mmCIF file of N, CA and C in Angstrom:
data_model
loop_
_atom_site.group_PDB
_atom_site.id
_atom_site.type_symbol
_atom_site.label_atom_id
_atom_site.label_comp_id
_atom_site.label_asym_id
_atom_site.label_seq_id
_atom_site.Cartn_x
_atom_site.Cartn_y
_atom_site.Cartn_z
ATOM 1 N N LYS A 3 -169.687 0.012 6.798
ATOM 2 C CA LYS A 3 -168.593 0.251 7.062
ATOM 3 C C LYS A 3 -168.613 -0.646 8.785
ATOM 4 N N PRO A 4 -167.488 -1.999 8.646
ATOM 5 C CA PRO A 4 -167.040 -2.289 10.226
ATOM 6 C C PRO A 4 -167.272 -1.264 11.146
ATOM 7 N N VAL A 5 -167.230 -1.362 11.911
ATOM 8 C CA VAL A 5 -167.060 0.032 13.122
ATOM 9 C C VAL A 5 -165.632 -0.775 14.307
ATOM 10 N N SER A 6 -164.707 0.012 14.393
ATOM 11 C CA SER A 6 -163.219 -0.373 15.658
ATOM 12 C C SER A 6 -163.615 1.030 16.559
ATOM 13 N N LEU A 7 -163.828 2.236 15.586
ATOM 14 C CA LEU A 7 -163.715 3.420 16.337
ATOM 15 C C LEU A 7 -162.363 4.048 16.833
ATOM 16 N N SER A 8 -161.036 3.568 16.670
ATOM 17 C CA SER A 8 -159.689 3.484 16.522
ATOM 18 C C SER A 8 -159.353 2.452 16.039
ATOM 19 N N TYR A 9 -158.019 3.156 15.063
ATOM 20 C CA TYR A 9 -157.803 2.343 14.381
ATOM 21 C C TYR A 9 -157.139 0.787 14.588
ATOM 22 N N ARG A 10 -157.315 0.721 15.741
ATOM 23 C CA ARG A 10 -157.094 -0.628 16.742
ATOM 24 C C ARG A 10 -155.794 -0.979 16.003
ATOM 25 N N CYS A 11 -155.981 -1.861 15.587
ATOM 26 C CA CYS A 11 -154.330 -2.618 14.414
ATOM 27 C C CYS A 11 -154.583 -2.233 13.093
ATOM 28 N N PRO A 12 -153.250 -1.945 12.741
ATOM 29 C CA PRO A 12 -152.907 -2.116 11.410
ATOM 30 C C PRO A 12 -152.899 -3.821 10.627
ATOM 31 N N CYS A 13 -152.641 -4.509 11.125
ATOM 32 C CA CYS A 13 -153.071 -6.078 10.781
ATOM 33 C C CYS A 13 -154.366 -6.258 11.300
ATOM 34 N N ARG A 14 -155.449 -6.640 10.087
ATOM 35 C CA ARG A 14 -156.624 -6.517 11.414
ATOM 36 C C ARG A 14 -156.572 -8.477 11.454
ATOM 37 N N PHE A 15 -156.636 -9.320 9.345
ATOM 38 C CA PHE A 15 -156.181 -10.084 9.309
ATOM 39 C C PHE A 15 -155.178 -10.936 9.572
ATOM 40 N N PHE A 16 -155.074 -12.200 9.602
ATOM 41 C CA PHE A 16 -154.296 -12.776 9.652
ATOM 42 C C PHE A 16 -154.474 -14.191 7.924
ATOM 43 N N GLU A 17 -152.960 -14.212 7.423
ATOM 44 C CA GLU A 17 -153.091 -15.545 6.479
ATOM 45 C C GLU A 17 -153.276 -16.500 7.463
ATOM 46 N N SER A 18 -152.021 -16.821 7.928
ATOM 47 C CA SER A 18 -151.894 -17.935 8.774
ATOM 48 C C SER A 18 -151.533 -19.685 8.198
ATOM 49 N N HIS A 19 -151.877 -19.112 6.713
ATOM 50 C CA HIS A 19 -151.535 -20.274 6.098
ATOM 51 C C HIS A 19 -150.132 -19.746 4.780
ATOM 52 N N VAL A 20 -149.279 -19.600 5.586
ATOM 53 C CA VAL A 20 -147.803 -18.521 4.852
ATOM 54 C C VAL A 20 -147.004 -19.436 5.234
ATOM 55 N N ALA A 21 -146.249 -20.353 4.474
ATOM 56 C CA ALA A 21 -144.964 -21.287 5.146
ATOM 57 C C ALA A 21 -143.733 -20.292 5.269
ATOM 58 N N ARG A 22 -142.449 -20.204 5.679
ATOM 59 C CA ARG A 22 -141.092 -19.325 5.821
ATOM 60 C C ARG A 22 -140.769 -19.611 4.197
ATOM 61 N N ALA A 23 -141.167 -20.532 2.804
ATOM 62 C CA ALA A 23 -140.241 -20.772 1.937
ATOM 63 C C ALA A 23 -141.319 -19.790 0.865
ATOM 64 N N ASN A 24 -142.258 -19.078 1.351
ATOM 65 C CA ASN A 24 -143.284 -18.251 0.777
ATOM 66 C C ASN A 24 -143.498 -16.747 0.880
ATOM 67 N N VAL A 25 -141.749 -16.888 2.226
ATOM 68 C CA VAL A 25 -141.854 -14.948 2.467
ATOM 69 C C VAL A 25 -140.654 -14.413 2.041
ATOM 70 N N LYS A 26 -141.413 -13.346 1.272
ATOM 71 C CA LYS A 26 -139.930 -12.645 0.402
ATOM 72 C C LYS A 26 -139.571 -11.407 1.391
ATOM 73 N N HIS A 27 -140.378 -11.473 2.551
ATOM 74 C CA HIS A 27 -140.168 -10.747 3.547
ATOM 75 C C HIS A 27 -140.320 -10.251 4.697
ATOM 76 N N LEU A 28 -140.133 -10.051 6.099
ATOM 77 C CA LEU A 28 -140.681 -10.224 7.442
ATOM 78 C C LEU A 28 -139.936 -9.161 8.150
ATOM 79 N N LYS A 29 -141.733 -8.544 8.605
ATOM 80 C CA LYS A 29 -141.334 -7.387 9.041
ATOM 81 C C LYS A 29 -142.245 -7.484 10.950
ATOM 82 N N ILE A 30 -141.547 -7.303 12.078
ATOM 83 C CA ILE A 30 -142.255 -7.290 13.208
ATOM 84 C C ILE A 30 -142.947 -6.810 13.614
ATOM 85 N N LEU A 31 -144.270 -6.449 13.235
ATOM 86 C CA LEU A 31 -144.919 -4.922 14.061
ATOM 87 C C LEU A 31 -144.961 -5.631 15.012
ATOM 88 N N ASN A 32 -145.248 -4.154 16.175
ATOM 89 C CA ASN A 32 -145.723 -4.489 18.039
ATOM 90 C C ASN A 32 -146.817 -3.484 18.019
ATOM 91 N N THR A 33 -147.966 -3.960 17.826
ATOM 92 C CA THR A 33 -148.812 -2.892 18.221
ATOM 93 C C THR A 33 -149.598 -2.920 19.800
ATOM 94 N N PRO A 34 -149.416 -1.936 20.743
ATOM 95 C CA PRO A 34 -149.321 -2.085 21.838
ATOM 96 C C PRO A 34 -151.191 -2.093 22.213
ATOM 97 N N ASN A 35 -151.419 -1.769 21.481
ATOM 98 C CA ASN A 35 -153.549 -1.771 20.992
ATOM 99 C C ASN A 35 -153.424 -3.113 20.888
ATOM 100 N N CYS A 36 -153.287 -4.149 20.126
ATOM 101 C CA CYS A 36 -153.866 -5.364 19.973
ATOM 102 C C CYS A 36 -153.098 -6.478 20.643
ATOM 103 N N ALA A 37 -151.942 -6.559 19.976
ATOM 104 C CA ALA A 37 -151.496 -7.918 20.388
ATOM 105 C C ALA A 37 -149.889 -7.662 19.005
ATOM 106 N N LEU A 38 -149.052 -8.900 19.210
ATOM 107 C CA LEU A 38 -148.433 -9.275 18.036
ATOM 108 C C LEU A 38 -148.440 -9.116 16.365
ATOM 109 N N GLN A 39 -148.150 -8.984 15.695
ATOM 110 C CA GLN A 39 -148.309 -9.598 14.342
ATOM 111 C C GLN A 39 -147.126 -9.521 13.794
ATOM 112 N N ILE A 40 -147.212 -9.903 12.542
ATOM 113 C CA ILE A 40 -145.898 -9.814 11.907
ATOM 114 C C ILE A 40 -146.195 -10.089 10.621
ATOM 115 N N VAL A 41 -145.701 -9.248 9.209
ATOM 116 C CA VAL A 41 -145.793 -8.945 7.887
ATOM 117 C C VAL A 41 -144.810 -9.853 7.316
ATOM 118 N N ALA A 42 -145.339 -10.632 6.283
ATOM 119 C CA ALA A 42 -144.571 -11.439 5.609
ATOM 120 C C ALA A 42 -144.897 -10.929 3.804
ATOM 121 N N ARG A 43 -144.551 -11.123 3.055
ATOM 122 C CA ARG A 43 -144.856 -10.608 1.370
ATOM 123 C C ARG A 43 -144.630 -11.931 0.931
ATOM 124 N N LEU A 44 -145.083 -12.099 0.208
ATOM 125 C CA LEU A 44 -145.456 -13.533 -0.269
ATOM 126 C C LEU A 44 -144.616 -13.499 -1.258
ATOM 127 N N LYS A 45 -143.957 -14.578 -1.677
ATOM 128 C CA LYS A 45 -142.958 -14.839 -3.085
ATOM 129 C C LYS A 45 -143.529 -14.820 -3.943
ATOM 130 N N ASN A 46 -144.660 -15.413 -4.093
ATOM 131 C CA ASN A 46 -145.727 -16.215 -5.580
ATOM 132 C C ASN A 46 -146.836 -15.275 -5.506
ATOM 133 N N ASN A 47 -147.095 -14.346 -4.891
ATOM 134 C CA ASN A 47 -148.522 -13.491 -5.125
ATOM 135 C C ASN A 47 -147.692 -12.029 -4.591
ATOM 136 N N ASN A 48 -146.102 -12.453 -4.111
ATOM 137 C CA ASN A 48 -145.655 -11.245 -4.129
ATOM 138 C C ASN A 48 -146.218 -9.576 -3.073
ATOM 139 N N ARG A 49 -147.705 -9.893 -2.633
ATOM 140 C CA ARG A 49 -148.228 -9.324 -1.765
ATOM 141 C C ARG A 49 -147.735 -9.269 -0.212
ATOM 142 N N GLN A 50 -147.501 -8.726 0.683
ATOM 143 C CA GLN A 50 -147.351 -8.649 2.492
ATOM 144 C C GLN A 50 -149.130 -8.520 2.900
ATOM 145 N N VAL A 51 -148.630 -10.116 3.123
ATOM 146 C CA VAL A 51 -149.842 -10.412 3.857
ATOM 147 C C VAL A 51 -148.897 -10.589 6.158
ATOM 148 N N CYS A 52 -150.254 -10.386 6.358
ATOM 149 C CA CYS A 52 -150.109 -10.081 8.027
ATOM 150 C C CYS A 52 -149.963 -11.472 8.567
ATOM 151 N N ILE A 53 -149.104 -12.250 9.420
ATOM 152 C CA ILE A 53 -149.448 -13.524 9.846
ATOM 153 C C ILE A 53 -149.644 -13.594 11.269
ATOM 154 N N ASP A 54 -150.054 -14.823 11.885
ATOM 155 C CA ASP A 54 -150.134 -14.908 13.321
ATOM 156 C C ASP A 54 -149.510 -15.484 13.576
ATOM 157 N N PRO A 55 -148.600 -14.782 14.902
ATOM 158 C CA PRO A 55 -147.706 -15.535 15.433
ATOM 159 C C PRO A 55 -147.681 -16.697 16.277
ATOM 160 N N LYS A 56 -148.657 -17.668 15.987
ATOM 161 C CA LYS A 56 -149.027 -18.561 17.082
ATOM 162 C C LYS A 56 -148.564 -19.311 16.023
ATOM 163 N N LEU A 57 -147.725 -19.243 14.966
ATOM 164 C CA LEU A 57 -147.384 -20.556 13.952
ATOM 165 C C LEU A 57 -146.245 -20.201 14.494
ATOM 166 N N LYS A 58 -145.733 -22.004 13.993
ATOM 167 C CA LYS A 58 -144.697 -22.844 14.549
ATOM 168 C C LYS A 58 -143.277 -21.972 14.248
ATOM 169 N N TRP A 59 -143.776 -21.833 12.913
ATOM 170 C CA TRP A 59 -142.200 -21.759 12.256
ATOM 171 C C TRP A 59 -142.134 -20.059 13.179
ATOM 172 N N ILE A 60 -143.164 -19.585 13.196
ATOM 173 C CA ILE A 60 -142.618 -17.860 13.694
ATOM 174 C C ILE A 60 -142.788 -18.192 14.702
ATOM 175 N N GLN A 61 -142.870 -18.553 15.514
ATOM 176 C CA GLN A 61 -142.478 -19.036 17.142
ATOM 177 C C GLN A 61 -140.658 -19.259 16.695
ATOM 178 N N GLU A 62 -140.120 -20.253 15.655
ATOM 179 C CA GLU A 62 -139.027 -20.750 15.619
ATOM 180 C C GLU A 62 -138.001 -18.744 15.185
ATOM 181 N N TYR A 63 -139.265 -18.191 14.173
ATOM 182 C CA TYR A 63 -138.153 -16.997 13.820
ATOM 183 C C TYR A 63 -138.400 -16.724 14.505
ATOM 184 N N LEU A 64 -139.128 -15.700 15.826
ATOM 185 C CA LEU A 64 -139.171 -15.284 17.135
ATOM 186 C C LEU A 64 -137.927 -15.616 18.131
ATOM 187 N N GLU A 65 -137.694 -16.406 18.030
ATOM 188 C CA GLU A 65 -136.635 -16.949 19.634
ATOM 189 C C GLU A 65 -135.674 -16.667 18.452
ATOM 190 N N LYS A 66 -135.241 -17.043 17.292
ATOM 191 C CA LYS A 66 -134.161 -16.671 16.097
ATOM 192 C C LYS A 66 -133.525 -15.500 15.582
ATOM 193 N N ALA A 67 -134.452 -14.172 16.113
ATOM 194 C CA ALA A 67 -134.508 -12.486 15.407
ATOM 195 C C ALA A 67 -134.833 -12.152 16.637
ATOM 196 N N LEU A 68 -134.822 -12.019 17.356
ATOM 197 C CA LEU A 68 -135.132 -12.006 18.908
ATOM 198 C C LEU A 68 -133.648 -12.146 19.662
ATOM 199 N N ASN A 69 -133.991 -13.222 19.645
ATOM 200 C CA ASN A 69 -132.918 -13.159 20.825
ATOM 201 C C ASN A 69 -130.838 -13.451 20.035
ATOM 202 N N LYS A 70 -131.039 -13.642 18.244
ATOM 203 C CA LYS A 70 -129.784 -13.398 18.362
ATOM 204 C C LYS A 70 -129.580 -11.929 16.821
#
């Protein structure tokens, strides 16, 4: 068992290799015990993946979604 003690982060791993056009659904999770993490559901895979906030299109997404 990989120990974490606490729950820590809902999203542990990030796909990062997720493009805007392959995203069915976007949810932004705010985890105080970790950092920010975005959840996207894949259109082709149909699964939800956790996205890394360092993605450029994500940065674009942030300024759009949080400001407007």
